[PDB]
Ligand binder design. Structure first.
Ligand code: HEM
Ligand code: HEM
Ligand SMILES: Brc1ccc2[nH]ccc2c1
Ligand SMILES: Brc1ccc2[nH]ccc2c1
Lengths: 137, 137
């Protein structure tokens, strides 16, 4: 279930973080505009960049912390506030987050592993609603 | 404290995993014998080797999960059994793990960060005891 999925993802954090982020960027090419350093590069080019690996590792680590602290797939309001108030998230809307979790669930369903994809979908939906309640457009 | 230390380490996972493993290998040169392809290399050369980066991250990812699942710095028996039953650990003894945690505690004390080094020392001793009860020589 959800808690085991967190353990599975944390066990190979960098590998999953890169694969999920690339799934997101390739499913929604327009989102790649938020990352000017990654424009014009193939998946294998990005995977060779130390900057890419470090960025995805840090984002995914915090996503796993938020998921681990959630109750019944409902994130803590304080975690949602943190994500809203981050300077790196100025200009972002809840739609950006919604698309990320669509790609994440689609990745889990296609991987063949026994991820609890329904729980991740609910978590994504509750996180979007918590970001709204925390002041994100 | 201990729980916050886990979060700190996970926040810069690749850096700490490599730094701590290198501190271990340089404090205990004999331990490089378990890693034949690491001999004759400086630290920066090791940090460029594919197997080194992948290995240290997977070790540290799982070590933080074991620490996170512990109660009062006592690991779960199931986590100890997992570490003992791993085919990669055949031929290892508790002494290899004891040396790892001496280096980790010394690293924390020399870092100037507010690590709860006393809790990590207890954790290491309690893990070693659990490994022995689970079957490791
Ligand atoms: C639960 C989901 C998310 C979490 C936990 C999260 C967390 C983070 C973290 C920790 C950083 C700092 C990373 C670093 O130091 O390189 C970061 C940066 C950033 N994030 Fe988020 N993020 C999330 C979702 C998103 C989404 C959906 C977008 C855009 C579609 C986004 C856009 C960015 C950008 C543009 C940066 C700055 C990257 C850079 O300057 O290189 N994040 N985020
Ligand atoms: C809390 C302590 C430890 C944890 C969680 C742990 C976990 C792991 C994991 C997950 C792997 C497989 C990762 C991979 O795919 O390479 C591994 C491999 C390995 N570990 Fe452990 N380990 C620990 C302690 C140690 C110690 C103390 C030693 C030796 C002094 C050691 C020696 C090895 C070796 C030789 C391998 C295989 C190397 C290879 O295949 O290239 N480990 N360990
Ligand atoms: Br997984 C993952 C990794 C890095 C990221 N950066 C922005 C969203 C995002 C998701
Ligand atoms: Br951190 C860390 C990373 C890799 C390792 N391999 C054997 C002990 C050890 C510790």
């Amino acid at each position: 279930g959800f808690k085991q999925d967190i353990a599975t993802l944390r066990g190979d954090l960098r590998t999953y973080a890169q694969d999920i982020f690339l799934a997101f960027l390739n499913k929604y090419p327009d989102e790649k505009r938020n990352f000017k350093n990654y424009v014009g590069k193939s998946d294998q080019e990005l995977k060779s960049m130390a900057k890419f690996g470090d960025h995805t590792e840090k984002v995914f680590n915090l996503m796993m912390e938020v998921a681990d602290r959630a109750t019944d797939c409902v994130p803590l309001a304080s975690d949602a506030s943190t994500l809203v108030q981050m300077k790196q998230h100025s200009g972002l809307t809840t739609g950006n987050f919604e698309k990320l979790f669509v790609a994440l669930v689609e990745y889990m369903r296609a991987s063949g592993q026994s991820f609890d994809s329904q729980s991740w979908d609910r978590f994504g939906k509750n996180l979007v609603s918590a970001l709204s309640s925390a002041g994100m457009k």
